[PDB]
Design a protein around this motif. Structure first.
Motif, PDB file in Angstrom:
ATOM      1  N   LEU A 101     -14.463   4.730   9.383  1.00  0.00           N
ATOM      2  CA  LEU A 101     -13.357   5.612   9.073  1.00  0.00           C
ATOM      3  C   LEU A 101     -12.654   5.992  10.373  1.00  0.00           C
ATOM      4  O   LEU A 101     -13.300   6.147  11.409  1.00  0.00           O
ATOM      5  CB  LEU A 101     -13.873   6.840   8.324  1.00  0.00           C
ATOM      6  N   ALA A 102     -11.330   6.090  10.333  1.00  0.00           N
ATOM      7  CA  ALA A 102     -10.563   6.584  11.465  1.00  0.00           C
ATOM      8  C   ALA A 102     -10.701   8.095  11.485  1.00  0.00           C
ATOM      9  O   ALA A 102     -10.445   8.736  10.463  1.00  0.00           O
ATOM     10  CB  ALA A 102      -9.115   6.195  11.313  1.00  0.00           C
ATOM     11  N   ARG A 127       0.844  -1.191   0.000  1.00  0.00           N
ATOM     12  CA  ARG A 127       0.000   0.000   0.000  1.00  0.00           C
ATOM     13  C   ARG A 127       0.882   1.245   0.000  1.00  0.00           C
ATOM     14  O   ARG A 127       0.545   2.287   0.577  1.00  0.00           O
ATOM     15  CB  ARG A 127      -1.058  -0.051   1.127  1.00  0.00           C
ATOM     16  N   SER A 148      -9.815   7.588  -1.876  1.00  0.00           N
ATOM     17  CA  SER A 148      -8.386   7.886  -1.833  1.00  0.00           C
ATOM     18  C   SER A 148      -7.719   7.612  -3.192  1.00  0.00           C
ATOM     19  O   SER A 148      -8.261   6.890  -4.021  1.00  0.00           O
ATOM     20  CB  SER A 148      -7.757   7.094  -0.677  1.00  0.00           C
ATOM     21  N   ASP A 178      -7.410   4.041  -3.859  1.00  0.00           N
ATOM     22  CA  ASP A 178      -8.773   3.652  -4.160  1.00  0.00           C
ATOM     23  C   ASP A 178      -9.068   3.792  -5.636  1.00  0.00           C
ATOM     24  O   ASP A 178      -9.728   2.929  -6.211  1.00  0.00           O
ATOM     25  CB  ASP A 178      -9.766   4.511  -3.384  1.00  0.00           C
ATOM     26  N   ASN A 195      -2.751   1.730   8.423  1.00  0.00           N
ATOM     27  CA  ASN A 195      -1.990   2.076   7.232  1.00  0.00           C
ATOM     28  C   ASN A 195      -2.764   3.026   6.344  1.00  0.00           C
ATOM     29  O   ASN A 195      -3.304   2.649   5.289  1.00  0.00           O
ATOM     30  CB  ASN A 195      -1.494   0.861   6.463  1.00  0.00           C
ATOM     31  N   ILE A 196      -2.825   4.267   6.809  1.00  0.00           N
ATOM     32  CA  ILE A 196      -3.514   5.335   6.096  1.00  0.00           C
ATOM     33  C   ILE A 196      -2.610   6.555   5.915  1.00  0.00           C
ATOM     34  O   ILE A 196      -1.726   6.798   6.733  1.00  0.00           O
ATOM     35  CB  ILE A 196      -4.877   5.698   6.767  1.00  0.00           C
ATOM     36  N   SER A 197      -2.810   7.298   4.829  1.00  0.00           N
ATOM     37  CA  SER A 197      -1.976   8.464   4.551  1.00  0.00           C
ATOM     38  C   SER A 197      -2.402   9.658   5.393  1.00  0.00           C
ATOM     39  O   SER A 197      -1.582  10.524   5.699  1.00  0.00           O
ATOM     40  CB  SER A 197      -2.008   8.839   3.069  1.00  0.00           C
ATOM     41  N   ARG A 205       2.630   4.548  -1.513  1.00  0.00           N
ATOM     42  CA  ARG A 205       2.009   5.558  -2.334  1.00  0.00           C
ATOM     43  C   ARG A 205       3.007   6.211  -3.286  1.00  0.00           C
ATOM     44  O   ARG A 205       2.632   7.100  -4.054  1.00  0.00           O
ATOM     45  CB  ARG A 205       1.248   6.557  -1.466  1.00  0.00           C
ATOM     46  N   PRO A 220      -9.051  12.392   8.789  1.00  0.00           N
ATOM     47  CA  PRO A 220      -9.846  13.628   8.793  1.00  0.00           C
ATOM     48  C   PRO A 220     -10.210  14.104  10.199  1.00  0.00           C
ATOM     49  O   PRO A 220     -10.334  13.303  11.126  1.00  0.00           O
ATOM     50  CB  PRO A 220     -11.110  13.248   8.006  1.00  0.00           C
TER      51      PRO A 220
HETATM   52  N1  LIG Z   1     -10.014   7.431   7.872  1.00  0.00           N
HETATM   53  C1  LIG Z   1     -10.032   6.194   7.361  1.00  0.00           C
HETATM   54  O1  LIG Z   1     -10.577   5.248   7.916  1.00  0.00           O
HETATM   55  C2  LIG Z   1      -9.351   5.949   6.064  1.00  0.00           C
HETATM   56  N2  LIG Z   1      -8.469   6.695   5.359  1.00  0.00           N
HETATM   57  C3  LIG Z   1      -8.163   5.982   4.236  1.00  0.00           C
HETATM   58  N3  LIG Z   1      -8.838   4.813   4.217  1.00  0.00           N
HETATM   59  C4  LIG Z   1      -8.798   3.731   3.212  1.00  0.00           C
HETATM   60  O2  LIG Z   1      -7.581   3.014   3.415  1.00  0.00           O
HETATM   61  C5  LIG Z   1      -6.915   2.779   2.183  1.00  0.00           C
HETATM   62  C6  LIG Z   1      -5.565   3.516   2.146  1.00  0.00           C
HETATM   63  O3  LIG Z   1      -5.664   4.929   1.925  1.00  0.00           O
HETATM   64  P1  LIG Z   1      -4.393   5.828   1.513  1.00  0.00           P
HETATM   65  O4  LIG Z   1      -3.667   4.899   0.564  1.00  0.00           O
HETATM   66  O5  LIG Z   1      -4.983   7.116   0.974  1.00  0.00           O
HETATM   67  O6  LIG Z   1      -3.665   6.110   2.793  1.00  0.00           O
HETATM   68  C7  LIG Z   1      -7.891   3.209   1.104  1.00  0.00           C
HETATM   69  O7  LIG Z   1      -8.624   2.044   0.714  1.00  0.00           O
HETATM   70  C8  LIG Z   1      -8.807   4.214   1.769  1.00  0.00           C
HETATM   71  O8  LIG Z   1     -10.119   4.202   1.194  1.00  0.00           O
HETATM   72  C9  LIG Z   1      -9.542   4.799   5.332  1.00  0.00           C
HETATM   73  N4  LIG Z   1     -10.364   3.768   5.689  1.00  0.00           N
END
Ligand SMILES: NC(=O)c1ncn([C@@H]2O[C@H](COP(=O)(O)O)[C@@H](O)[C@H]2O)c1N
Lengths: 109, 85, 315
Positions: free
Chosen positions: C194-195, C138, C304, C307, C214-216, C140, C219
């Motif tokens: 969602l986190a 994952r 994202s 996504d 593992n998120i970028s 980026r 919010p």
């Molecule tokens: N706040 C969140 O939960 C959240 N932020 C991103 N995501 C998901 O986690 C995955 C990784 O996101 P990114 O590659 O942008 O960090 C993508 O599938 C995205 O829809 C989340 N579930």
């Protein structure tokens, strides 16, 4: 901030000698002025690429050095790459890595 | 044609009234890394500057080194941040 | 014929398009590449990212002339979160200022954060190969590394980042325009669980949301549930570039206050909206993610960049 080669100020052949002594220290071999019984500020250095030596390969890297007056007392040591070469038969490395070597040498005299 | 010994004539001092080196030509005056003209996009590099060392002070205790170089038909200027030891 | 079938076919084109292009065709015709020597101290590297405006740098092992991994902001995100969950000592963290990049990556290898396999694609291979890796992991962003023949040296050509290939295919494809299927009709992005965070949230508690999920980005929402802002993982750079590792003890509010104006933004869309539009976004603005909201900016989901790259890459 960004400018070609390495700045140096002082005496014409005192830097040229600086530049010679620095080349010795790294190992690089070099050409030598042939007195005609100005090109003495054009040096062609042959460096041994250390990530090849220690492997076994005799691949070298070829670096011409040029000195120019910029203004009275102030000089540039230009440093060009003429590519790399093995004994048997592009990129900025090892070239940048070796300019790194040379520059360290120049600065610690 | 390569020598490993440091040339003699230099040692002994102001020997013959030695030949002057050439003056800096307008081509090496301007280094393309002085440019905010995508902030990785640069002006097309000179034909002749390719494979010439560029340097800048960091105020940080490291050496900054670059060369521009071709890669197939596109150009890669690569900036190096590296220690002295 | 219809919306769900004009999109299905345009999808079919943009994938075919990217098998047909190299990672190389994506890079500007002439560009710079900052590289850090792996022997650099951390502080130095962080000063060097701030000063050059960059969030990342590829690493050079000058010793064997190899690529010693990639310095993203994920490194700092992973060490602090570990230090927080492992150390009984809150100030232990300031100790990662002695470390050279090499030695931070050694801590990271031990923790299981950095894979042993160092990830890379050859620049002249398909653009697809850059999409599938970054996607299988994952990640980026992905390095383009070729190898110099006459030396066995690794020529590091560029770094390729999700946004830049998404900006690329946006520009070089007419079919982005034929993607008119709304988001609420697609299986895409995250919509449940969602986190999140409020301003009162502690920063160290965001950043591990970041590591674990593992998120970028995370919010920031209020009590009424409405989106306000986003604490990105790249925002961590702006918190520790001064080597005050106790800024990790601030509130998000306190933290966001220190954020400078050089900020790409917080982008939104309706769940009614469709891909054709978000491509128009990423074509001009520097987009990094879209937040699905509603009438009153209540958060409904996250679409994202991965996504979307993954929606289009997979058959
Ligand atoms: N706040 C969140 O939960 C959240 N932020 C991103 N995501 C998901 O986690 C995955 C990784 O996101 P990114 O590659 O942008 O960090 C993508 O599938 C995205 O829809 C989340 N579930």
């Amino acid at each position: 901030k960004w400018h070609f080669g390495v700045r140096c100020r002082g005496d014409a052949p005192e830097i040229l000698l600086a530049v010679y002594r620095a080349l010795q220290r790294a190992g690089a071999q070099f050409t030598v002025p042939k007195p005609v019984n100005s090109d003495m500020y054009t040096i062609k250095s042959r460096w041994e690429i250390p990530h090849c030596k220690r492997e076994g390969k005799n691949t070298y890297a070829y670096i011409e050095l040029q000195l120019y007056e910029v203004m009275p007392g102030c000089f540039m040591l230009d440093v060009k790459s003429n590519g790399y070469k093995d004994i048997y038969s592009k990129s900025s490395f090892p070239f940048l890595d070796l300019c790194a070597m040379l520059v360290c040498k120049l600065f610690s005299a | 044609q390569y020598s490993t010994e440091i040339p003699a004539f230099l040692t002994s001092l102001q020997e013959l009234k030695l030949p002057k080196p050439p003056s800096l030509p307008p081509h090496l005056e301007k280094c393309i890394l002085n440019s905010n003209t995508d902030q990785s996009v640069l002006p097309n590099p000179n034909h002749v500057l390719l494979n010439h060392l560029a340097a800048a002070n960091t105020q940080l205790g490291v050496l900054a080194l670059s060369a521009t170089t071709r890669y197939h038909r596109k150009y890669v200027t690569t900036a190096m941040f590296k220690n002295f030891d | 014929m219809d919306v769900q079938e004009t999109q299905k076919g345009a999808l079919k084109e943009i994938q075919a398009f990217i098998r047909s292009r190299t990672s190389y065709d994506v890079l500007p015709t002439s560009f710079r590449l900052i590289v850090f020597d792996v022997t650099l101290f951390v502080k130095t590297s962080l000063s060097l990212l701030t000063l050059n405006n960059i969030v990342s740098a590829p690493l050079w092992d000058s010793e064997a002339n190899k690529f010693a991994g990639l310095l993203t902001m994920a490194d700092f995100v992973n060490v602090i979160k570990y230090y927080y969950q492992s150390s009984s000592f809150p100030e232990a963290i300031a100790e990662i200022d002695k470390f050279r990049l090499l030695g931070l990556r050694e801590v990271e290898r031990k923790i299981g954060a950095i894979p042993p396999e160092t990830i890379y694609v050859h620049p002249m291979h398909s653009l697809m190969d850059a999409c599938l890796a970054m996607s299988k992991s994952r990640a980026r962003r992905i390095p383009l590394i070729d190898v110099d023949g006459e030396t066995g040296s690794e020529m590091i050509v560029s770094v390729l980042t999700q946004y830049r290939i998404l900006k690329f295919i946006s520009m070089n494809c007419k079919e982005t325009a034929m993607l008119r299927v709304p988001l609420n009709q697609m299986t895409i992005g995250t919509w449940s669980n969602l986190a999140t965070a409020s301003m009162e949230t502690k920063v160290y508690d965001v950043i591990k949301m970041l590591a674990e999920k593992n998120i970028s980005a995370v919010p920031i929402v209020n009590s009424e549930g409405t989106l306000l802002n986003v604490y990105e993982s790249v925002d961590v750079m702006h918190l520790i570039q001064d080597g005050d590792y106790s800024n990790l003890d601030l509130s998000v509010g306190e933290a966001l206050l220190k954020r400078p104006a050089n900020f790409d933004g917080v982008h939104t869309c309706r769940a009614t909206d469709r891909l054709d539009g978000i491509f128009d976004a990423i074509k001009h603005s520097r987009v990094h993610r879209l937040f699905v909201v509603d009438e009153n900016l209540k958060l409904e989901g996250i679409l994202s960049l991965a996504d979307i790259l993954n929606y289009i890459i997979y058959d």
